[PDB]
Structures are given as structure tokens and as C-alpha cells.
Amino acid sequence: MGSMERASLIQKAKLAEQAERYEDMAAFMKGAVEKGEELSCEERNLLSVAYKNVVGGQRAAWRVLSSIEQKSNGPEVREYREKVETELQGVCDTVLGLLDSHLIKEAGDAESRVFYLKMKGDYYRYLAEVATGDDKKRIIDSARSAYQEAMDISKKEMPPTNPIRLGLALNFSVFHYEIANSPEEAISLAKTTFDEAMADLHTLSEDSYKDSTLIMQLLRDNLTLWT
Amino acid sequence: MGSMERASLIQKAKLAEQAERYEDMAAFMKGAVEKGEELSCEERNLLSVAYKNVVGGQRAAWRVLSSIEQKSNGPEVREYREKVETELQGVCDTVLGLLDSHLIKEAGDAESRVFYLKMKGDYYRYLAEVATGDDKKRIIDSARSAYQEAMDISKKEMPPTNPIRLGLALNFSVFHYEIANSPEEAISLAKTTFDEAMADLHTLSEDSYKDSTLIMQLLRDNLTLWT
Amino acid sequence: AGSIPGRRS
Amino acid sequence: AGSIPGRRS
Numbered sequence: 001m002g003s004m005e006r007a008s009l010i011q012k013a014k015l016a017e018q019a020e021r022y023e024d025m026a027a028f029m030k031g032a033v034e035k036g037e038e039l040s041c042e043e044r045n046l047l048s049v050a051y052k053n054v055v056g057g058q059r060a061a062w063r064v065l066s067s068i069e070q071k072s073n074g075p076e077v078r079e080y081r082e083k084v085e086t087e088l089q090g091v092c093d094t095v096l097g098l099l100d101s102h103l104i105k106e107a108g109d110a111e112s113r114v115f116y117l118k119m120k121g122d123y124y125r126y127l128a129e130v131a132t133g134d135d136k137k138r139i140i141d142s143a144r145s146a147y148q149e150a151m152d153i154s155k156k157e158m159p160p161t162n163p164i165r166l167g168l169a170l171n172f173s174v175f176h177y178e179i180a181n182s183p184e185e186a187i188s189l190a191k192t193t194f195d196e197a198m199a200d201l202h203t204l205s206e207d208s209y210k211d212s213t214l215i216m217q218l219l220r221d222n223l224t225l226w227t
Numbered sequence: 228m229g230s231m232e233r234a235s236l237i238q239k240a241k242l243a244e245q246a247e248r249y250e251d252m253a254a255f256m257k258g259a260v261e262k263g264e265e266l267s268c269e270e271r272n273l274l275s276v277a278y279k280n281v282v283g284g285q286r287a288a289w290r291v292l293s294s295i296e297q298k299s300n301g302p303e304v305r306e307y308r309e310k311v312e313t314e315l316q317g318v319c320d321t322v323l324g325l326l327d328s329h330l331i332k333e334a335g336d337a338e339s340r341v342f343y344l345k346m347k348g349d350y351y352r353y354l355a356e357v358a359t360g361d362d363k364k365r366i367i368d369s370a371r372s373a374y375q376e377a378m379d380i381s382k383k384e385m386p387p388t389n390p391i392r393l394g395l396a397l398n399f400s401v402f403h404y405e406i407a408n409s410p411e412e413a414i415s416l417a418k419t420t421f422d423e424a425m426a427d428l429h430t431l432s433e434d435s436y437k438d439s440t441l442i443m444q445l446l447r448d449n450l451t452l453w454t
Numbered sequence: 455a456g457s458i459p460g461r462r463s
Numbered sequence: 464a465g466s467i468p469g470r471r472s
């Protein structure tokens with residue numbers, strides 16, 4: 001994408017989303033990041049939407065194949081699960097590489113830095129979902145460390161209803177439950193997040209209230225599933 | 228896919244369908260066709276499902292982009308519509324190339340030959356949906372010719388309830404309505420197909436009845452939309 | 455309108 | 464269970 005203007009890549013990412021062409025969307029956003037400039041709030045959301053949808057489809061396919069493989073236990077199911085797994089790892093490595101070169105280091109405002117560290121935690125979490133080898137513990141710890149740094153900044157710099165702070169807590173709680181084998185930590189985090197957001201809703205406008213309550217409902221949905 | 232066994236490609240195509248990885252499915256089936264052997268009924272359905280789903284997604288994206296472009300009338304929307312269009316044309320050309328080298332020429336049984344000629348008509352129809360240049364009339368006529376040869380064989384060799392004969396008539400009727408600007412021909416074909424199938428249902432087992440009536444309902448749904 | 459689907463569903 | 468979606472929908 002080196003020969004395409006930044007603004008054209010952003011415009012085409014928006015078109016790709018409307019056309020449900022998420023692989024294209026992600027490629028356009030990778031090209032935009034590689035222009036080297038910081039991303040605005042809207043552009044950060046395009047980057048996240050694109051890769052979350054690409055890896056989300058890979059994760060769903062990996063889970064279908066992993067289920068078939070486990071029931072089976074010729075080489076074909078394992079080979080094909082491995083192929084999908086390698087592709088998934090490649091996309092996660094690409095996102096992590098964009099964050100490391102150089103989105104995080106240039107992000108000084110709390111909103112941008114938390115957003116990118118939340119992404120970093122998420123893509124290490126997706127790597128941890130498929131990990132089995134000598135580095136699996138280190139992948140889990142890399143997710144934990146990114147989420148923890150994001151949490152520390154969010155608690156110092158953002159109100160408890162801020163949607164990025166809430167989504168971060170939601171995802172870190174999923175990490176605790178599904179990756180770290182820490183269901184109590186997951187439940188505690190989701191509960192305290194929900195309750196502290198509830199107590200700050202009175203400060204919000206109607207549109208901000210809608211955003212915060214939407215994520216609070218996701219927290220509540222998980223708590224209902226986990227308890 | 229040249230180094231993978233035929234049977235492994237077929238197995239992986241089935242897995243790819245279960246995982247909703249239709250691009251992979253199509254690649255595995257292209258590799259299976261390129262082994263050079265004829266395809267069984269089940270394998271023909273894997274080939275068709277794979278490419279129908281890939282091109283179906285490209286068509287839906289092209290229609291979203293074409294709508295945006297028409298409302299707009301910078302270069303980006305047209306450029307991106309053109310990119311999706313070229314990809315779509317490439318997939319259609321690939322399918323047509325498999326049919327021409329050498330699926331159709333080796334297909335002697337009416338069921339296989341009709342199936343492949345129906346596919347040929349469909350992929351020329353998809354090319355016609357995006358065509359505008361000096362060859363557009365020739366693309367439309369190529370679709371027509373393939374469908375017509377399939378129809379002539381189906382009427383001589385298959386009962387009026389045969390699901391391939393019915394699906395062929397359904398698709399050729401869509402061709403008449405949406406491509407050839409022949410809505411009366413489309414309605415006539417759908418009506419006569421439906422009525423002749425109805426009169427042959429008494430010969431069928433429960434499972435064959437289910438197949439034939441499912442396609443008859445598609446014919447009826449189009450007739451309701453068109454009248 | 456609608457053409458044939460790939461699978462009976 | 465569920466993580467954050469990309470869009471509010």
C-alpha cells in the first residue's frame with residue numbers, strides 16, 4: 001500500500017467495512033499505520049474493527065477444526081487445523097508488529113495508549129488460545145502485562161464509565177476466565193467494574209450513557225454466564 | 228495443491244465448508260479438479276458450493292460499492308469497486324477454465340454434463356452482471372448458449388422433477404429476468420417448469436419429493452416477486 | 455430474484 | 464464469555 005495516499009487508504013477502509021470485506025479493510029489500515037503518522041480515534045477504531053473481524057473468523061474456524069480433531073483423537077484434520085492456526089498466528093504477529101512499530105511508543109494520551117495496550121493484550125490472548133509449546137506461559141504473561149499496564153493508566157486517567165476503560169476491563173476479565181484459569185479474578189474484575197461504572201452514570205449525557213450502559217450489559221452477561 | 232493427494236483435497240474441502248472457509252474450500256476443489264479425474268456427484272457439489280459462496284460474497288460487495296459509486300455520481304470508490312470487480316472476474320475465469328479444461332468435455336452422463344453447463348451459464352451470468360465493454364453482448368450470449376445446451380439435454384434425459392433440471396431452469400429464468408431483459412421469458416420458464424414438476428411429484432419418494440418441492444418453492448418465490 | 459443455493463439449507 | 468465487539472452493534 002506504499003504508493004496509496006494515507007487519506008485514500010482510510011477512505012477505502014471505510015468502504016471495505018461497508019462491503020464486509022474485512023481482509024481488505026485490514027490491509028488498507030495496515031497501509032495507513034505504515035505511513036508513520038499517529039491515528040485519530042476514528043482511525044484507531046477502523047484498525048481494531050478490521051483485525052478483530054479477520055482474527056475473529058480465524059478463531060471461529062480454528063475452534064470448529066479443533067473440535068473435529070479432538071473427536072477424531074489420517075493427518076488431514078490436524079494438517080488443516082495447523083494451517084488455519086499458522087494463518088491466525090501470522091495475523092496476530094502482524095497486529096502486534098504494528099503496535100510495536102510504532103503505535104504504542106508514540107501514544108502519549110491516555111485514550112490512545114490504553115486503546116493500543118488493550119489491543120496488545122487481545123492479540124497475545126488470541127495467540128494464547130492456540131498455544132501449546134515452550135513459549136505458552138510467556139504468551140500468557142505478555143497478554144497479562146499489556147492488559148495490566150492499560151489498566152493502571154485507565155484507572156489513573158479515565159473515569160470509570162469511559163468506554164475504552166470499560167472494554168479493557170471486559171476483555172481482561174475474559175482473559176482471566178478463559179486463559180489464566182482465574183475465574184474468581186474474572187468475576188471480581190467484572191463486578192467491581194460494573195459497580196463503579198453504575199455509580200458514575202449520573203455524570204453522563206444521553207449518548208455517553210448509552211455507550212457505557214452497553215458495555216456494562218456485556219459485563220453483566222458474562223457475570224450471569226459465570227455465576 | 229499439486230503435491231496433495233486427491234482424497235486429502237476432498238477431505239479438506241469438506242472440513243473447510245464446516246469451518247466456513249470457502250476460499251480454502253475453493254482452492255482445495257480446484258486442486259482436486261486439476262488431478263484430471265472426473266468428479267462424482269458429491270464432489271461436483273463441493274466444487275459448486277465453494278465457488279458459489281466465494282463469488283456470492285464478491286457479488287454482494289460489488290453491489291454495495293456500485294451503489295455507493297452511483298450515488299457519488301475522488302477516485303477511491305470507483306478504484307475500489309474496480310478492484311473487487313477484477314477479483315470477481317478472476318474467480319469466474321478460473322471456474323470457467325476448470326469447466327473448459329476439461330470437466331465438460333469428459334462429462335458424458337446427462338447429470339454431470341447438465342451440472343457443468345449450468346455452472347458455465349452461471350459464471351458467465353456473474354461476468355455479465357459487471358460487464359459494460361465491447362464484449363458484454365458476447366458474455367451474455369455465452370451464458371445463454373451454455374444454459375440452452377443444458378436445457379436441451381435436461382429435457383431429453385431427465386424427469387421434470389430432477390433437482391439439477393429444476394435448478395437449471397430456476398437459474399436460466401433468473402438470467403432471462405435480470406440479464407437478458409426478458410421478464411416474460413423468465414416468467415414463462417418458471418411457470419412451465421413449476422407446473423411440469425408438480426405433475427411428476429406423484430412418482431417420487433419422500434426424500435426426492437422434498438428436494439423437488441424445495442426448488443419448486445424457489446420458482447414460486449420468484450414468480451411472486453415478478454408478478 | 456433468487457438462484458439455486460449451494461446446499462439445501 | 465463475550466469480549467468487546469468492534470462496533471456498538
Ligand SMILES: *Cc1ccc(S(=O)(=O)N2CCc3ccccc32)cc1
Nearest residue numbers: 163164167211214467468469470471
Ligand atoms: C476497546 C474499545 C472500547 C470502546 C470503544 S468505542 O467507545 O469507540 N466503541 C466501539 C465499540 C463499542 C461497543 C460499545 C460501546 C462503545 C463502543 C472502542 C474500543
Ligand SMILES: *Cc1ccc(S(=O)(=O)N2CCc3ccccc32)cc1
Nearest residue numbers: 390391394438441458459460461462
Ligand atoms: C444446480 C443444482 C441443483 C440441485 C442440486 S442438488 O440436488 O444436489 N441439491 C443441492 C442444492 C439443492 C437445493 C435444493 C434441492 C436440492 C439441492 C445441485 C445443483
Ligand SMILES: [Cl-]
Nearest residue numbers: 079080083239
Ligand atoms: Cl492443509
Ligand SMILES: [Cl-]
Nearest residue numbers: 038106107108
Ligand atoms: Cl504522540
Ligand SMILES: [Cl-]
Nearest residue numbers: 012306307310
Ligand atoms: Cl483499491
Ligand SMILES: [Cl-]
Nearest residue numbers: 265333334335
Ligand atoms: Cl466421462
Ligand SMILES: [Mg+2]
Nearest residue numbers: 004005006007
Ligand atoms: Mg501523502
Ligand SMILES: [Mg+2]
Nearest residue numbers: 231232233234
Ligand atoms: Mg495420488
